[PDB]
Motif scaffolding. Structure first.
Motif, PDB file in Angstrom:
ATOM      1  N   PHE A 273      84.306  84.086  46.228  1.00 31.04           N
ATOM      2  CA  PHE A 273      83.396  85.221  46.135  1.00 31.04           C
ATOM      3  C   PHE A 273      81.942  84.785  46.080  1.00 31.04           C
ATOM      4  N   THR A 274      81.679  83.512  45.813  1.00 31.32           N
ATOM      5  CA  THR A 274      80.313  83.014  45.859  1.00 31.32           C
ATOM      6  C   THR A 274      79.892  82.607  47.267  1.00 31.32           C
ATOM      7  N   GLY A 275      80.827  82.153  48.100  1.00 31.91           N
ATOM      8  CA  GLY A 275      80.464  81.881  49.478  1.00 31.91           C
ATOM      9  C   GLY A 275      79.486  80.721  49.602  1.00 31.91           C
ATOM     10  N   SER A 276      78.671  80.733  50.665  1.00 33.06           N
ATOM     11  CA  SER A 276      78.610  81.781  51.689  1.00 33.06           C
ATOM     12  C   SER A 276      79.876  81.889  52.527  1.00 33.06           C
ATOM     13  N   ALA A 277      79.906  82.890  53.409  1.00 31.88           N
ATOM     14  CA  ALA A 277      81.055  83.068  54.290  1.00 31.88           C
ATOM     15  C   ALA A 277      81.277  81.831  55.150  1.00 31.88           C
ATOM     16  N   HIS A 278      80.213  81.309  55.763  1.00 31.99           N
ATOM     17  CA  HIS A 278      80.397  80.147  56.623  1.00 31.99           C
ATOM     18  C   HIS A 278      80.683  78.896  55.808  1.00 31.99           C
ATOM     19  N   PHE A 279      80.163  78.818  54.584  1.00 34.69           N
ATOM     20  CA  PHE A 279      80.577  77.745  53.684  1.00 34.69           C
ATOM     21  C   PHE A 279      82.081  77.795  53.446  1.00 34.69           C
ATOM     22  N   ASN A 280      82.602  78.983  53.113  1.00 30.46           N
ATOM     23  CA  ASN A 280      84.036  79.143  52.877  1.00 30.46           C
ATOM     24  C   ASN A 280      84.852  78.749  54.101  1.00 30.46           C
ATOM     25  N   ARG A 281      84.454  79.236  55.275  1.00 30.74           N
ATOM     26  CA  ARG A 281      85.213  78.931  56.483  1.00 30.74           C
ATOM     27  C   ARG A 281      85.213  77.435  56.756  1.00 30.74           C
ATOM     28  N   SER A 282      84.096  76.765  56.476  1.00 30.66           N
ATOM     29  CA  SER A 282      84.046  75.319  56.652  1.00 30.66           C
ATOM     30  C   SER A 282      84.981  74.615  55.676  1.00 30.66           C
ATOM     31  N   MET A 283      84.925  74.992  54.398  1.00 31.77           N
ATOM     32  CA  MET A 283      85.789  74.359  53.409  1.00 31.77           C
ATOM     33  C   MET A 283      87.259  74.632  53.706  1.00 31.77           C
ATOM     34  N   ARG A 284      87.571  75.839  54.174  1.00 33.92           N
ATOM     35  CA  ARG A 284      88.962  76.176  54.457  1.00 33.92           C
ATOM     36  C   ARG A 284      89.473  75.432  55.685  1.00 33.92           C
ATOM     37  N   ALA A 285      88.619  75.254  56.695  1.00 34.09           N
ATOM     38  CA  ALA A 285      89.008  74.447  57.847  1.00 34.09           C
ATOM     39  C   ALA A 285      89.256  72.999  57.439  1.00 34.09           C
ATOM     40  N   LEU A 286      88.376  72.445  56.600  1.00 36.83           N
ATOM     41  CA  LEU A 286      88.559  71.087  56.095  1.00 36.83           C
ATOM     42  C   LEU A 286      89.883  70.946  55.355  1.00 36.83           C
ATOM     43  N   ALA A 287      90.201  71.914  54.493  1.00 35.57           N
ATOM     44  CA  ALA A 287      91.457  71.856  53.755  1.00 35.57           C
ATOM     45  C   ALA A 287      92.645  71.759  54.704  1.00 35.57           C
ATOM     46  N   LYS A 288      92.601  72.509  55.806  1.00 41.37           N
ATOM     47  CA  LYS A 288      93.693  72.483  56.773  1.00 41.37           C
ATOM     48  C   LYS A 288      93.897  71.083  57.337  1.00 41.37           C
ATOM     49  N   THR A 289      92.804  70.368  57.621  1.00 46.54           N
ATOM     50  CA  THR A 289      92.926  69.014  58.145  1.00 46.54           C
ATOM     51  C   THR A 289      93.589  68.073  57.149  1.00 46.54           C
ATOM     52  N   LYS A 290      93.525  68.387  55.855  1.00 44.92           N
ATOM     53  CA  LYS A 290      94.107  67.546  54.820  1.00 44.92           C
ATOM     54  C   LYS A 290      95.493  68.025  54.398  1.00 44.92           C
ATOM     55  N   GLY A 291      96.117  68.893  55.190  1.00 46.86           N
ATOM     56  CA  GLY A 291      97.427  69.408  54.837  1.00 46.86           C
ATOM     57  C   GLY A 291      97.410  70.383  53.684  1.00 46.86           C
ATOM     58  N   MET A 292      96.311  71.110  53.504  1.00 43.45           N
ATOM     59  CA  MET A 292      96.164  72.052  52.406  1.00 43.45           C
ATOM     60  C   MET A 292      95.733  73.408  52.950  1.00 43.45           C
ATOM     61  N   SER A 293      95.806  74.421  52.089  1.00 42.44           N
ATOM     62  CA  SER A 293      95.337  75.760  52.420  1.00 42.44           C
ATOM     63  C   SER A 293      94.567  76.290  51.222  1.00 42.44           C
ATOM     64  N   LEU A 294      93.357  76.781  51.461  1.00 44.39           N
ATOM     65  CA  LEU A 294      92.481  77.273  50.407  1.00 44.39           C
ATOM     66  C   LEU A 294      92.274  78.771  50.575  1.00 44.39           C
ATOM     67  N   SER A 295      92.563  79.528  49.520  1.00 44.67           N
ATOM     68  CA  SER A 295      92.315  80.964  49.474  1.00 44.67           C
ATOM     69  C   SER A 295      91.646  81.300  48.151  1.00 44.67           C
ATOM     70  N   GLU A 296      91.329  82.584  47.962  1.00 38.83           N
ATOM     71  CA  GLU A 296      90.791  83.029  46.681  1.00 38.83           C
ATOM     72  C   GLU A 296      91.799  82.902  45.544  1.00 38.83           C
ATOM     73  N   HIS A 297      93.085  82.707  45.855  1.00 34.98           N
ATOM     74  CA  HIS A 297      94.123  82.541  44.843  1.00 34.98           C
ATOM     75  C   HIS A 297      94.319  81.088  44.431  1.00 34.98           C
ATOM     76  N   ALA A 298      94.283  80.154  45.379  1.00 30.08           N
ATOM     77  CA  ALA A 298      94.704  78.798  45.058  1.00 30.08           C
ATOM     78  C   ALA A 298      94.350  77.844  46.186  1.00 30.08           C
ATOM     79  N   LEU A 299      94.245  76.569  45.818  1.00 30.99           N
ATOM     80  CA  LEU A 299      94.321  75.452  46.748  1.00 30.99           C
ATOM     81  C   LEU A 299      95.752  74.934  46.712  1.00 30.99           C
ATOM     82  N   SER A 300      96.447  75.041  47.836  1.00 28.87           N
ATOM     83  CA  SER A 300      97.859  74.710  47.918  1.00 28.87           C
ATOM     84  C   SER A 300      98.075  73.623  48.961  1.00 28.87           C
ATOM     85  N   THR A 301      99.259  73.024  48.918  1.00 29.35           N
ATOM     86  CA  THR A 301      99.691  72.124  49.976  1.00 29.35           C
ATOM     87  C   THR A 301     100.446  72.920  51.037  1.00 29.35           C
ATOM     88  N   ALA A 302     100.621  72.301  52.201  1.00 29.57           N
ATOM     89  CA  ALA A 302     101.192  73.009  53.340  1.00 29.57           C
ATOM     90  C   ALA A 302     102.600  73.507  53.029  1.00 29.57           C
TER      91      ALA A 302
END
Ligand SMILES: [Cl-]
Ligand SMILES: [Cl-]
Ligand SMILES: [Cl-]
Ligand SMILES: [Mg+2]
Ligand SMILES: [Mg+2]
Ligand code: NA
Ligand code: NA
Ligand code: NA
Length: 330
Positions: free
Chosen positions: A271-300
């Motif tokens: 909720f703090t963002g920015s939106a493009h910050f979030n999208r960048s961090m979430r894309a990075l998480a995917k490359t590391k076998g993870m998924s980032l949402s407002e609920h949790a940082l999880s593994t694949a």
DNA sequence: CGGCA
DNA sequence: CAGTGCT
DNA sequence: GCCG
DNA sequence: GCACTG
């Protein structure tokens, strides 16, 4: 890490050495965006951020291409602006674009609705008011068209947050309320107010929306609801409209999310963002076998929920240096 | 080729 | 479901 | 639009 | 990446 904006401080953009390029690319990016070419628009947005943060003016095709987010096509446009001082394509944007922008600035009307209205021959908000079928949301958006395009002083955002916080803490004094979004990133003005609510006991956040919204309605503070699913008690977010008391007040957009404490760090990051910050961090998480949402940082998925008691832990688990909110303003 | 949160 | 908006 |  | 509408 050079490739990832979430690995870099957003203050790099304050020294834009390529404004004569980015101000022209932004006109094109918006044109693609309102016409619905979202992936082309996204590439432009990323290229614009890459140019804004580059350490010097770009002066050669080879230099441009070396910048992550700048390819051959974008490099060709940069070189045209350098030599000629302008970009020819800006004189060949679809004539529908100004009207599509006008229509899609109605809250609840996106590119698909704007294009349909345009096809049906509408050209002004007077045409929309008098001839278009509006959804309940779009009618509220039209009613508040000018106000939703205004930003408020951050001091007004503080007053709105305090209004929500006082109403919430009146029936549970242990609730935590934090203004996020652009407010938490330190901006002088805010397009809306984003209020996150939780409770450290892990449980007392449940069911508070009904009481909180009714309390805020009782004092006339909430003037219109845009998204509020109040029927089954599982509501997570409220999107609506408020107005402080007294003269000289405008209607302001208000977003509220209520979250369990175990998700506090991830919800605060989202909720703090920015939106493009979030999208960048979430894309990075995917490359590391993870998924980032407002609920949790999880593994694949077959996932495991990683422990993230603080925002710093999310950064750490992704191999990123910590950024305070003001440095996430991408 | 396909994702792009 | 498609469309929309949140960061 | 750009990226891997 | 998710939570909403109708
Ligand atoms: Cl165009
Ligand atoms: Cl209490
Ligand atoms: Cl934290
Ligand atoms: Mg906001
Ligand atoms: Mg908001
Ligand atoms: Na490049
Ligand atoms: Na809109
Ligand atoms: Na905004």
């Amino acid at each position: 890490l050079d490739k990832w904006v979430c690995a870099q401080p957003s203050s790099q953009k304050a020294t834009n050495h390529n404004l004569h390029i980015t101000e022209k690319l932004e006109v094109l990016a918006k044109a693609y965006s309102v016409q619905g070419d979202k992936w082309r628009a996204l590439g432009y947005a990323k290229a614009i951020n890459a140019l804004k943060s580059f350490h010097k003016p770009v002066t050669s095709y080879q230099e441009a291409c070396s910048i992550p987010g700048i390819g051959k096509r974008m490099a060709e446009k940069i070189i045209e602006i350098l030599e000629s001082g302008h970009l020819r394509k800006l004189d060949h944007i679809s004539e529908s674009v100004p009207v599509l922008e006008l229509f899609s600035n109605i809250w609840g009307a996106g590119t698909k609705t704007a294009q349909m209205w345009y096809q049906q021959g509408f050209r002004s908000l007077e045409d929309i008011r008098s001839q278009a079928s509006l959804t309940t949301q779009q009618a509220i958006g039209l009613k508040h068209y000018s106000d939703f395009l205004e930003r408020m002083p951050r001091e007004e955002a503080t007053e709105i947050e305090q209004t929500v916080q006082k109403a919430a803490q009146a029936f549970n004094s242990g609730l935590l309320c934090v203004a996020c979004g652009s407010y938490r990133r330190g901006k002088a003005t805010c397009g809306d107010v984003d209020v996150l609510i939780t409770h450290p006991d892990g449980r007392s956040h449940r069911g508070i929306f009904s009481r909180l919204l009714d309390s805020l309605r009782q004092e006339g503070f909430l003037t219109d609801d845009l998204v509020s699913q109040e029927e089954n008690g599982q509501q997570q977010k409220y999107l609506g409209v408020c107005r402080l008391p007294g003269p000289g007040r405008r209607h302001r957009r208000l977003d509220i999310i209520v979250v369990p404490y175990s998700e506090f760090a991830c919800a605060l990051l989202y909720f703090t963002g920015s939106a493009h910050f979030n999208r960048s961090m979430r894309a990075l998480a995917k490359t590391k076998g993870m998924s980032l949402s407002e609920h949790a940082l999880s593994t694949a998925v077959v996932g495991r929920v990683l422990p993230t008691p603080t925002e710093k832990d999310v950064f750490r688990l992704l191999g990123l240096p910590y950024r305070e909110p003001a440095e996430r303003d991408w």
